[PDB]
Symmetry: D2
Subunit: 390 residues, 4 copies
């Protein structure tokens, strides 16, 4: 009755206005699901549900998860639903799957997340019943539904300056963390460490998109020191110590260990612990701390027991606060780099981080990992994960 | 370890361009949650999660469920997430809660759904990177993300004409079903049968909105026969045998029976069975049939054992196909009327139907009910529900 | 006999903002006036050399509003047409344009007027062609961007008029008195039937409604009620929704020709154009524009202010009426005698043609001999015509 | 009492999404007016009026002509108004000036036209009072207010296929006319023949925009034969035998000959005749024919007396129909190329064609020219023009 992750796969991550700008989030997910089914040879009839994270659902059409399922080639008999816990959404899909299997509602779920920030439409709140007289606003949905706090209407980056102030996170420390994320990601990418987990996407000439494109390998802390604050005049957060506005998808099979063995799957990770926590919306970057403590308590693990922490780099400041609050060794925190380098396709990111850890533990023979994401609105999600031997 | 529903409550349902047109879906949910907490006296710290259904999330701001939780007065320590299984979303929130409790992730969840179709914005897909030259479309989000099939871009009502054709559902039968829904709802409303489940909403313009406003009590099958088809030239589906574009919210506590007793709650329903099924998108109206069979199989019930079926009236045609395919007695199908009368606020409707059944079984002493909804894209959700006696 | 005359001046009633004409394009209002003008005059359509129409909010009205007015008005496709824009002066400019075409030998007979429908002005999306890229973007109300906001400052005409108020020491109390008097004079004139002769009713299909009476006026207006209103354009201002006109819709048109041409074709001339003035001033003091324009028109006519029976000066704001009246020393009883735009409305591009129409009919009724029509113009201009009644 | 054109000047013409895409039409006009005043040394107080053509007025702000005048450095005492006779607008501004001078309203007018088709906004007709339910359209103003017929809502190019059908204008003839326009324009441009009339524009790095950019010198009849019809499935009109969606401005001084001499101006052209005509909207391409006949009748000229015709290339098909109906020698029709090559910035084009002819007659010592434009909605405008020594 161990719940395991099998066949975790992801697209490469697109840059803002980059290679995936014309490819809907649901099409990215459908491509990963189609590929997962063809590579595993899993009988499509054994899929009980598709669960997908997606934050910017505006204009994506009815129920993104059902589009991912049907356009991914699954039989129309497979149900599907879409979950939204903001940046946690792609990890939430896997927690949702775990709950459905443990509760007896499902035996096997395809879970993941999708996002395409270019494909987020503009919103016209006054178009239905009229603006009447005077200028009116068209809202960028990626700000209104994705990155701005629902209570303040301030950017997540504006709020994170209060986390920076509270934990005395220097500009210099943020830029060092960001430069290190770029350097670690570039070295891992050059070593071929992401080839196994990436499903190339054909863009119609045809272009094969096979490599993460959002990263800047030549980044130095000295170069980052030159950038202007992006969110407050006297701020520390810049375009260089924050991730971009990215596109991508990831998906994986969630089942009991027995079900995976029965159907000839090769489990990658066992879910040993799950944590979901919430904090003040204004201090959302702290969310992973209580979430990780809950996941570690379920797994009966100490911080010192964990080979690697994979914590989303929503901002360098959030990575530093979570790492230092929990006393995690810098060499065991975002070992192969994070979202500052590869990008943060909101609803997909949690599924991407699970995918990275599945493949990294197999490569390194590391035994124990934690995946965690901070969540706009003041939440955190964490999974404690153990490598399954072949 | 029985999973029970306590303190199910709902707003009245707003008409399109009606009383709730300026009240965001998240504010409707927050109002229900705030009221549920004050009436139950439930310690807010005992709420482990808020799960809310919402289909038209466009322009509602970051994570509707978290807005419902925080604006409902729950501590910032209570996590929240939003689910979307289209018309099933408000029932899905309760299934999600059940799964979290049975799997040990949660002990007590506030679950429900919210929708406001007036508040759905228009979408401009070409505004980010430009239309360049030539006219461009601004899409109505309630069609693009709610009512149009994602595969065909045809209205759910257009697709339902193929269900009508396949099951030979006459225009006359659809209009009789619709007139009966209006008549049953009007009589139940006049008897005061919805007063207990409704939390009035104060609209500052202040006026108190306390009564469902979308229904048409004077409806007759003869009157409905005069209406033009809404979705196809040779169609049977009209504005009169389909629900409106409505607004509302509903929420309830989901917990083990033991947890409910421990915290001084009065359980209304025990969840005896859950069914989630999927079919051809083009025949989505059939979805409740396999879903109901799954829920009844988990409950070890036969159709004839059930006191009332509460099946969403997405169209009169869908109600008739589901009722007649399962051989349900017409007097036990949507007993107090359905969405044709009271409205279909998409993401809230499943939570509203659970709320109606919770209060109807208490009033009637009926023991066994099924709530089911068809789902755009070809799905169905069903819960088999048993009345819990007063302690 | 080579004197230039106005014949058969006619107008629609003026619609309120979000009122009876909200679904009727400006070009359709003009077409309706032209159709009626042709049937009442019996003018052979082939004798029309050109149609000139004022229109300020051209956005979304389709190619060349004047040509739509002409063709939809039932004129042969052989009749040329063009649209002029001198903002609030546009409807009077069309008549000056006609005068210049006739005096220069380009035309013998012109149908001139103006059209506007402020409800029908669309919103503009400047960022939709090439994209907003990231972050919120503005949809502009065209009636502000192209009609009422100054092109240099982007401030409302009403914001700028507060500087005219300061310079000419125009009290809030004086503005509210002027506004109350405009409402009272217009309501009395309307009730007496004094606008029935000049108005062409419009049938609106909804059932059908016959729109036959100006609807934008507020006869119950009091100085006490006006004193309670908040300043509309500056927090410590004097200009309010009550001492300014609305956002209105309407059309007017008339025949311009030599007196000899009018007689030849069996038309009944109403007015002789005795003088024309077009002037410009500081954009921020545009309300003063009529003063130099009126002086130019009076100089051409060889008239003194005291020779003029009535001044018809557009009430863009009560403040503008007061400045023009008091600067020229005009008797209050001879200034906007039958009320003005504060009461009946200001359908921008039509207003100048409406004021010429009002004066044509008022001089006939009263046997007054001499009038001046003048309008202030956003961007700092003024237009004026000195007009003499033609005897029958 | 001869009415003359002096100091005709223009910007280079921008391509669609090209160098002028961020520069408002009124700013292009202001730049030409500022340069005209510096070069002539004309006392700004001697300008009685500014008249500007502009067709896509949507979003340009209150009264484009007044913005051109004030931003061009004219005193606030100079009145200004904007005219719209669609593609004829830039020539109409000069006719308007002529009428104001002959009627005694004005002694000296700055007249011209401005257009920037990139800068034309999208329109939302349903945003004021609401779309209520169901998808709604955002209209491209350049189609709604500029290029689509107001009666049919069909593109001018769609209507011109009926002119093509009526006059049996072959695809091959249209592509030959278009290739010849490109070849003639490229050769004239390379010879420096447009340098005198062009006022360069600096766009902020900086771009110094000094040369027309919309033309395609490598155009061949063989290449044009490969293009798909743009307006009808079995049509003849393509992106290659029609002009683009362009930006530019032109302006000139209009006055009596005596006034020009008095103020030390150098007259370029005398207006000898003016024609304004109208036809069935769908066959608007024919409009120049009756308009040219009116202008020639006022000038007491025959077609054979005219050294060059400058007729707007709204479509190759329109140029061919006008040329062949009037029996004009192909070597005397759009001699230095036309809008297919250099572009058609709607409201400016008529003023641009007057500017081209002013400078071409000075260079060639040709005596007599006609400028004419077809006009959407079924109109035509023509001026008969004589070189001043
Ligand atoms: C749900 C928790 C969260 C979050 C987040 C985040 C951070 C996004 C970074 C962005 O705001 C900007 O830095 C992107 C700058 C865009 C630069 C560009 O134009 O591509
Ligand atoms: C997710 C499954 C589903 C569904 C559904 C549905 C039915 C919606 C009915 C409405 O589309 C129609 O009644 C149109 C409403 C007309 C009201 C109006 O025009 O104001
Ligand atoms: C060309 C020169 C000029 C001018 C002018 C003007 C009009 C000012 C009044 C308007 O701006 C506003 O008061 C209209 C108020 C609208 C309120 C409403 O109808 O809801
Ligand atoms: C007022 C009379 C007229 C006219 C006209 C015209 C012709 C317009 C040509 C354009 O429609 C064509 O260039 C098609 C536009 C191609 C757009 C592009 O460059 O992508």
């Amino acid at each position: 009755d161990e719940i395991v992750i099998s066949s975790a796969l992801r697209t490469p991550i697109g840059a803002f206005s980059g290679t995936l700008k014309d490819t809907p989030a649901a099409a990215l997910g459908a491509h990963v699901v189609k590929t997962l089914l063809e590579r595993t040879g899993l009988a499509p009839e054994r899929v009980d549900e598709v669960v997908m994270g997606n934050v910017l659902q505006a204009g994506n059409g009815m129920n993104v998860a059902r589009q991912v399922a049907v356009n991914g080639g699954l039989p129309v008999a497979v149900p599907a639903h879409t979950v939204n816990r903001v940046c946690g959404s792609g990890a939430q899909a896997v927690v949702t799957a775990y709950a459905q299997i443990r509760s007896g509602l499902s035996n096997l779920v395809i879970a993941g997340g999708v996002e395409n920030m270019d494909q987020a439409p503009y919103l016209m709140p006054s178009l239905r019943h009229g603006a009447r007289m005077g200028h009116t606003q068209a809202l960028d949905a990626l700000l209104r539904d994705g990155l701005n706090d629902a209570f303040s209407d301030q950017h997540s980056g504006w709020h994170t300056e209060d986390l920076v102030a509270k934990y005395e996170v220097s500009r210099e420390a943020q830029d060092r963390f960001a430069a290190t994320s770029q350097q670690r990601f570039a070295a891992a990418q050059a070593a071929g460490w992401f080839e196994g987990e990436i499903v190339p996407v054909t863009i119609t000439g045809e272009t094969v998109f096979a490599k993460d494109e959002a990263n800047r390998p030549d980044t130095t802390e000295a170069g980052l020191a030159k950038l202007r604050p992006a969110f407050r005049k006297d701020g520390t957060i810049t375009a260089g110590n924050a991730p971009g506005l990215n596109a991508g998808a990831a998906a994986m099979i969630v089942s009991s260990h027995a079900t995976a063995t029965e159907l000839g799957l090769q489990p990658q990770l066992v879910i040993r612990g799950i944590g979901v926590a919430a904090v003040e919306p204004g201090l959302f970057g702290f969310g992973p701390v209580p979430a990780i403590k809950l996941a570690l308590a379920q797994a009966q693990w100490q911080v010192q027991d964990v080979d690697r922490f994979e914590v989303n780099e929503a901002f360098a400041a959030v990575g530093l606060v979570v790492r230092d609050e929990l006393g995690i060794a810098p060499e065991r925190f975002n070992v192969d780099g994070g979202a500052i380098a590869h990008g943060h396709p909101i609803g997909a990111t949690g599924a991407i981080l699970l995918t990275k850890v599945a493949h990294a533990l197999r490569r390194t023979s590391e035994r124990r990992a934690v995946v965690s994401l901070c969540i706009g609105g003041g939440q955190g999600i964490a999974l404690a994960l153990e490598r399954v031997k072949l």
